[PDB]
């Protein structure tokens, strides 16, 4: 089932290389994964930790850093930005 992102995530999703206006939760999770990989925001030593504060990802999440072992900060933002 599709959802429309709010503008900030949208821009990030297109920055990943996604196309379109409406996404599924499945494809938003791929391109967010794709985004961090290409933007090299994960820590090179502790690869589970992502440091996003200096990027547009940081202001979207409302954070500086987060870990993938706890992705409840991802849940926060998906709930708020995908109508």
């Amino acid at each position: 089932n599709q959802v429309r992102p709010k503008l900030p995530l949208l821009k990030i999703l297109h920055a990943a290389g996604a196309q379109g206006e409406m996404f599924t939760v499945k494809e938003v999770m791929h391109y967010l994964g794709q985004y961090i990989m290409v933007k090299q925001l994960y820590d090179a030593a502790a690869q589970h930790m992502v440091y996003c504060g200096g990027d547009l990802l940081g202001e979207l999440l409302g954070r500086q850093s987060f870990s993938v072992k706890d992705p409840s900060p991802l849940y926060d933002m998906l709930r708020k930005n995908l109508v």
């Binding site: 939760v25 961090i36 990989m37 690869q47 993938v68 992705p71």
Partner: peptide, 12 residues
């Protein structure tokens, strides 16, 4: 263990 291995431990 890479980040692209960690990432896909999450459901979509």
């Amino acid at each position: 263990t890479s980040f692209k291995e960690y990432w896909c431990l999450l459901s979509p």
